[PDB]
Input
Amino acid sequence: VKRQEEVAKAIYDRRMNSIEQALKIAEQHNISRSATDVPAEELPDSEMFLLG
Amino acid sequence: VKRQEEVAKAIYDRRMNSIEQALKIAEQHNISRSATDVPAEELPDSEMFLLG
Output
């Protein structure tokens, strides 16, 4: 139970970091439209910049 | 564990090269030889030009 708790936290922390980095790039290049209709739930950690 | 870290490194490096080559050809034929560039507009909805 202790091992399963720390595994889920590591994944959650990684997702937090990726979101923050993609926000800075989007504001720098001034992209506000939704380039892709695929929902953010199933997007690879690389490509959040394909969102407004 | 160390083997798993170097497997993901190889895939990540392959994605690096693929994107760089796309920029080279796009900045050689579309921009350098032809007048097509960012000021050509139609960036939001032009399919291939949206991925310019």
